[PDB]
């Protein structure tokens, strides 16, 4: 557990208030189990809804892998992400499940492939998907404020970070102790940012500043 209180004191800094974030007041419970299948937007084509399997759990997050793809493009979603749903959600809504972009077979093998993987599959029930947190009505972040941020280059990691700059609805996230190489701009609505103390509360590891 990272001592934010001591760190905000020695850096003469403020943590961005919780109201800045599209996150729940309390970290949502994670009742997902490794092996459970669900529906997710393919990060490599966000128009596609694909079958994903939980290959890891960490705090309120799921590590996901798309069935029929590869093990090199896993992605992390919170249990209250709007980009994940129970199987059957896509169809109920007038849509069709797609092969992942990294699909290991030819496309005409898809319809039969879907049947094989869904056959007696462990599926996440709809009741363990958590509700979408309320969003801020505007960008309430201020320059200099600290937070917890997913390192998008190593998304398993949530790290000590600072708001460097603000342009309208975008905030510039910088990683304390790391070269500007891990910096990024994101929307203030980003699911990848959390108030200080959130990880400790969700049992997710929290990276201290880098040694640079
Ligand atoms: C913002 N977090 C940075 C983590 C980067 C870790 C990387 N493997 C390295 O050691 O460079």
Curated annotation (Swiss-Prot):
User: Which portion of the complete protein is shown here?
Assistant: 175 to 385 of 877
Q: Where are the transmembrane segments?
A: none
* GO molecular function term, any single one: sequence-specific DNA binding
Q: What is this protein's gene name?
A: Scm
Q: What's the domain of life for this entry?
A: Eukaryota
Give me the Gene Ontology terms describing cellular component.
nucleus; polytene chromosome
Protein name stated in the entry: Polycomb protein Scm
The record's function comment reads:
Polycomb group (PcG) protein. PcG proteins act by forming multiprotein complexes, which are required to maintain the transcriptionally repressive state of homeotic genes throughout development. PcG proteins are not required to initiate repression, but to maintain it during later stages of development. They probably act via the methylation of histones, rendering chromatin heritably changed in its expressibility.
- Into which family does the record put it? Belongs to the SCM family.
Key word Repressor present: yes
Q: Where is this gene product found?
A: Nucleus
Main localization, broad class: nucleus
Q: Name one GO biological process term.
A: ventral cord development
Q: Subunit structure of this entry?
A: Scm associates with the PRC1 core complex containing PSC, PC, PH and Sce/RING1. Forms homotypic and heterotypic interactions. Interacts with the SAM domain of ph-p via its SAM domain in vitro. Interacts with corto in vitro.
Keyword Zinc carried by entry: yes
Q: Give the MBT repeat ranges.
A: 2-100, 108-209
The record's keywords, sorted A to Z, are:
Chromatin regulator, Developmental protein, Metal-binding, Nucleus, Phosphoprotein, Repeat, Repressor, Transcription, Transcription regulation, Zinc, Zinc-finger
Q: What is known of its domains?
A: The SAM domain is essential for function.
């Amino acid at each position: 557990a990272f001592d934010w209180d001591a760190y905000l004191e020695e850096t003469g800094s403020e943590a961005a208030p919780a109201k800045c974030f599209k996150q729940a007041q309390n970290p949502p419970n994670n009742d997902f189990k490794i092996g459970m299948k669900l529906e997710a937007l393919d990060p490599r084509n966000v128009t596609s809804t694909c079958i994903a399997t939980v290959v890891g759990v960490l705090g309120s997050r799921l590590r996901l892998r798309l069935d029929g793809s590869d093990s090199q493009n896993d992605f992390w979603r919170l249990v209250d992400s709007t980009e994940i749903h129970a199987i059957g959600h896509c169809e109920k809504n007038g849509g069709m499940l797609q092969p992942p972009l990294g699909f290991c077979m030819n496309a005409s093998s898809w319809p039969g492939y879907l049947c094989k993987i869904l056959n007696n599959a462990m599926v996440a029930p709809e009741e363990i998907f958590q509700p979408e947190p309320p969003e801020p009505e505007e960008n309430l972040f201020k320059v200099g404020q600290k937070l917890e941020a997913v390192d998008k280059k190593n998304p398993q990691l949530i790290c000590c970070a600072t708001v460097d700059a603000i342009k309208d609805d975008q905030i510039h996230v910088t990683f304390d102790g790391w070269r500007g190489a891990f910096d990024y701009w994101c929307n203030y609505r980003s699911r990848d940012i959390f108030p200080a103390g959130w990880c400790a509360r969700s049992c997710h590891p929290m990276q201290p500043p880098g040694h640079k």
